[PDB]
Each structure stands twice: as structure tokens, then as C-alpha cells.
Scaffold this active site. Structure first.
Site, PDB file in Angstrom:
ATOM      1  N   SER A   1       6.483  -3.422  -7.551  1.00  0.00           N
ATOM      2  CA  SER A   1       6.691  -2.891  -8.899  1.00  0.00           C
ATOM      3  C   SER A   1       7.406  -3.894  -9.818  1.00  0.00           C
ATOM      4  O   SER A   1       7.487  -3.646 -11.030  1.00  0.00           O
ATOM      5  CB  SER A   1       7.430  -1.545  -8.882  1.00  0.00           C
TER       6      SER A   1
ATOM      7  N   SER B   1       8.973   3.482 -12.441  1.00  0.00           N
ATOM      8  CA  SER B   1       7.943   2.853 -11.598  1.00  0.00           C
ATOM      9  C   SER B   1       6.678   3.713 -11.451  1.00  0.00           C
ATOM     10  O   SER B   1       6.015   3.779 -10.407  1.00  0.00           O
ATOM     11  CB  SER B   1       8.592   2.443 -10.263  1.00  0.00           C
TER      12      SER B   1
ATOM     13  N   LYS C   1       5.496  -4.954 -13.054  1.00  0.00           N
ATOM     14  CA  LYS C   1       5.512  -4.045 -14.229  1.00  0.00           C
ATOM     15  C   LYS C   1       6.255  -4.629 -15.412  1.00  0.00           C
ATOM     16  O   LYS C   1       5.809  -4.473 -16.587  1.00  0.00           O
ATOM     17  CB  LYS C   1       6.034  -2.618 -13.859  1.00  0.00           C
TER      18      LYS C   1
ATOM     19  N   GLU D   1      -2.694  -0.475  -8.928  1.00  0.00           N
ATOM     20  CA  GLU D   1      -1.821   0.413  -8.085  1.00  0.00           C
ATOM     21  C   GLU D   1      -2.788   1.383  -7.424  1.00  0.00           C
ATOM     22  O   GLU D   1      -3.674   1.852  -8.060  1.00  0.00           O
ATOM     23  CB  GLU D   1      -0.919   1.287  -8.965  1.00  0.00           C
TER      24      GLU D   1
ATOM     25  N   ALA E   1       9.143  -2.006  -3.949  1.00  0.00           N
ATOM     26  CA  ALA E   1       9.040  -1.741  -2.530  1.00  0.00           C
ATOM     27  C   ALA E   1       7.580  -1.674  -2.302  1.00  0.00           C
ATOM     28  O   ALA E   1       6.813  -1.199  -3.191  1.00  0.00           O
ATOM     29  CB  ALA E   1       9.706  -0.373  -2.141  1.00  0.00           C
TER      30      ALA E   1
ATOM     31  N   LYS F   1      14.512  -4.713 -12.447  1.00  0.00           N
ATOM     32  CA  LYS F   1      13.359  -3.956 -11.986  1.00  0.00           C
ATOM     33  C   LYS F   1      13.218  -4.136 -10.465  1.00  0.00           C
ATOM     34  O   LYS F   1      13.200  -5.277  -9.956  1.00  0.00           O
ATOM     35  CB  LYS F   1      12.094  -4.417 -12.709  1.00  0.00           C
TER      36      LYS F   1
END
Lengths: 154, 261
Positions: free
Chosen positions: B43, B103, B46, B139, B210, B207
Site C-alpha cells: 500500500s 488503504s 498509494k 489491487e 502489508a 504510509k
């Protein structure tokens, strides 16, 4: 916030009741992109488990949702099982085709609250352990399958 | 004592770790450990995504107020904010907020759609001098972290330098740099990492990410007296430890570089 708090929360409850059971300011957020609703997280961290709650114009809880508050006891859905589900099948038919131990609920809601017709349940069925495994998703409205989806099942 | 700790964390996780600390103003690197091995972004990508977005805003190619209506088939694993706006839609600005602070996976995909996909994010990055960071998938697949797969990876030094450029260069306008770092400051789901070991008065915009196979990381601009003066980036991958153990190892690197600032 935790799954056990999620189970305490009840349809019809007011914003303030939900907020209190959920953990209040420490565990829960409202406003900004959440709007009038409530999001509670079980811990900090990327992809932390959460529950979300939305209210009618009259202030009553009509919707509960979550991801990752529960984990399948036996991740084991196969595309085989998925191929034998179809829109219109009852919920008992669904569980005769797909092993229920391979699924968890990701929410329940009454889009017509305080009328109860159109109740919707959402199930998420992991094919294996870990973060983003292959899976199937099923939604039922009043005990009848009305949405089915799968990603990457064998 | 940071490099020590970083080395400690490596054999406690039984995974590769990579670490870099960069002075925000000068661009000078203060210390590092495997700065140039590659790691899954997870993440953390992002934030780069949303810099590419602001860049198009700056160029009059995008509006932060533009409303995007999406539907049930756009929703993927981990959509805490986007599940709730199926009906009324979300603006580009709301999308960036949801992607960075919570997230939200769908939000990130919807934003990748606005700029034309992972290869446009890689091209944007490539066009500002980062020839290493690459996004290849959407994603939630970008988080797989297959060993040796270079898809969707960066290097600690490439991500630190790129974040520096986004956050202080002239790469974005002042309004955009500020919104980008405002989004990171409101980070809401990174409390147990650096924020964990940060003392009052400190500024932190970060930020975290995982992924699978134990993969974890964070990127952050932080410092004393409410002002960011450094960029810190940490990635780890491969590890079998628990989710909280790794958590612990990273708080530990930040308790150290905070002590030895």
C-alpha cells in the site's frame, strides 16, 4: 473494537449506542469520507479488520458490515463448488454446494428498515489462508442467492 | 542504535530488510542498509499514485472535484470507505483520502483507472527520474510478493528519493505538495509503526503497507518541532514471524533512529 463488539451491535440502535458499544473515539471514526456512518478498526496497521455501520434518516442502524473480523475455520472452496451455485438458489442450497466452514459473513442489512423485507447477507469464502487468497463471494436477499462472484479459484 | 537494530531485525524476522534515511531538504542520505534491493511496495504505492493524480490536476487534466460513480463489480478485497459510496459516488479527492489514510483497495484501483493504469503510474515515475519503481498490477494482486518477482517493487532509495521529490520539489505545485502530505499526516492505520515511537511535538506523515509472505513496510516524512526534516523508508519481505512481531521490529528501528536523530 472487536468481533464480539460487532455482535453486540443491533439493528435499530442509534448512532450513540453503536458508537458506545463499538469503542467510541479510540476505536471508531465518523465524518469525512465516512459521512454520517461509523467505521471502527480493531487495531492499526494496513488492512486492519473493521466494522462499518450506517443509520437511517431517522437515526436507526440499518446496516452492519465488516472485513476480516472473522476467518474461515477451513478455507477450502473449490471452483467446483462455485460452478454448482446459481442465482435463485436458497441459502440451504448454497450451503449444500459450498462448504460453510470455508466462509464468513461480511455483513447484514435491511435496506428497507424499519421494514424487514429485502434483508441482505454477504458471505466471503477464502480458498486458502493468508491475506488476499483466491475466493468466492455470495450475497443473498431474504434467503435467496442474488449475487455470486469468484476470483482466481482452482 | 539504528543500523545495528536494522541488522538485529533481519535475523529476528529471518527475512531481508531494507532501510534508508534521507535528509528531506538536502537530499543527502544519512544511513542505509540494502538501499538497492527490491521489495514489494504494497500500500506504500498509494502515495505515488496520488502524486501522479495531483500532477494531472496541476496540468489541468484532472479535477479533484470530479465525481466518479462506480458499481459493485469494482469492489475488491478491503474497501472500508468505498463500499459505502456505491450509490452516491466519490470525488477524486475523496478517493485519494480513502486510498492513503484507510488503504482502501477499490479506491486505489479507481484512481489507477483515472490515470490509465499501472503502466501510466510507472511512466509518470519514469518521467521524473525514477527508473526503478514500477507498478504492474491492480489491487489486490500487486501485494503477492512472489520471491524474486520484480513486479510492483521499488528500492528503498528509489522510493525515498521519489517521495522527496513529490513532497518538496517543484514536481507538484505548492497546493498539491501540501494536499499530498496532508493525506499522509491523517494516515489513520499506521499507529503501531513509526507513530508508535514518536514523541510529542514531532510531525509525522506516513504510509504503511502489508502484503503476502510476511511482507511489510513504511514510508514517512518526519521530524521535531512539528516539521518534517527527514524521509525514512523501511521494507521487509520473506518473513515467517507474526504480524505483531514484524510490527515490533519496525517500531524498533524507529525508536532507534528517533533516539539517535
Amino acid at each position: 473494537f472487536s468481533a464480539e463488539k460487532y455482535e453486540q451491535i443491533q439493528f435499530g440502535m442509534t448512532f450513540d449506542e453503536v458508537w458506545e458499544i463499538g469503542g467510541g473515539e479510540a476505536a471508531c471514526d465518523t465524518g469525512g469520507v465516512i459521512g454520517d456512518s461509523i467505521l471502527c478498526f480493531t487495531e492499526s496497521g494496513d488492512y486492519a479488520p473493521y466494522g462499518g455501520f450506517s443509520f437511517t434518516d431517522e437515526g436507526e442502524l440499518w446496516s452492519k458490515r465488516n472485513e476480516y473480523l472473522y476467518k474461515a475455520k477451513t478455507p477450502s472452496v473449490k471452483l467446483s463448488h462455485y460452478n454448482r451455485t446459481a442465482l435463485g438458489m436458497t441459502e440451504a442450497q448454497l450451503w449444500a454446494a459450498v462448504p460453510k466452514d470455508s466462509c464468513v459473513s461480511q455483513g447484514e442489512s435491511y435496506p428497507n428498515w424499519p421494514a424487514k423485507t429485502g434483508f441482505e447477507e454477504k458471505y466471503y469464502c477464502a480458498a486458502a489462508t493468508g491475506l488476499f487468497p483466491p475466493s468466492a463471494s455470495f450475497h443473498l436477499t431474504d434467503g435467496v442467492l442474488t449475487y455470486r462472484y469468484q476470483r482466481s479459484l482452482t | 542504535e539504528t543500523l545495528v537494530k536494522v541488522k538485529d531485525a533481519e535475523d529476528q524476522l529471518g527475512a531481508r530488510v531494507g532501510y534508508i534515511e534521507l535528509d528531506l531538504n538536502s537530499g543527502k542520505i544519512l544511513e542505509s542498509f540494502r538501499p538497492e534491493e527490491r521489495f514489494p511496495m504494497m500500500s506504500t504505492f498509494k502515495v505515488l499514485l496520488c502524486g501522479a493524480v495531483l500532477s494531472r490536476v496541476d496540468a489541468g487534466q484532472e479535477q479533484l472535484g470530479r465525481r466518479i460513480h462506480y458499481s459493485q463489480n469494482d469492489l475488491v478485497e478491503y474497501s472500508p470507505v468505498t463500499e459505502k459510496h456505491l450509490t452516491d459516488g466519490m470525488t477524486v479527492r475523496e478517493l485519494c483520502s480513502a486510498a492513503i489514510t484507510m488503504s482502501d483497495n477499490t479506491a486505489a484501483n479507481l484512481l489507477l483507472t483515472t490515470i490509465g493504469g499501472p503502466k501510466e503510474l510507472t511512466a509518470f515515475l519514469h518521467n521524473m527520474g525514477d527508473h526503478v519503481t514500477r507498478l504492474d498490477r491492480w489491487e489486490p494482486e500487486l501485494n503477492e510478493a512472489i520471491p524474486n518477482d520484480e513486479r510492483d517493487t521499488t528500492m528503498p532509495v528509489a522510493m525515498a528519493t521519489t517521495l522527496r521529490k513529490l513532497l518538496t520539489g517543484e514536481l507538484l505545485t505548492l497546493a498539491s505538495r501540501q494536499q499530498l502530505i496532508d493525506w499522509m499526516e491523517a494516515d489513520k492505520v499506521a499507529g503501531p509503526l513509526l507513530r508508535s515511537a514518536l514523541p510529542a511535538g514531532w510531525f509525522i506523515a506516513d504510509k504503511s503497507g502489508a502484503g503476502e509472505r510476511g511482507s511489510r513496510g513504511i514510508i514517512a516524512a518526519l521530524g521535531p518541532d512539528g516539521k518534517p526534516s527527514r524521509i525514512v523508508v523501511i521494507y521487509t519481505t520473506g518473513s515467517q514471524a507474526t504480524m505483531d512481531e514484524r510490527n515490533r521490529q519496525i517500531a524498533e528501528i524507529g525508536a532507534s533512529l528517533i533516539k539517535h536523530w
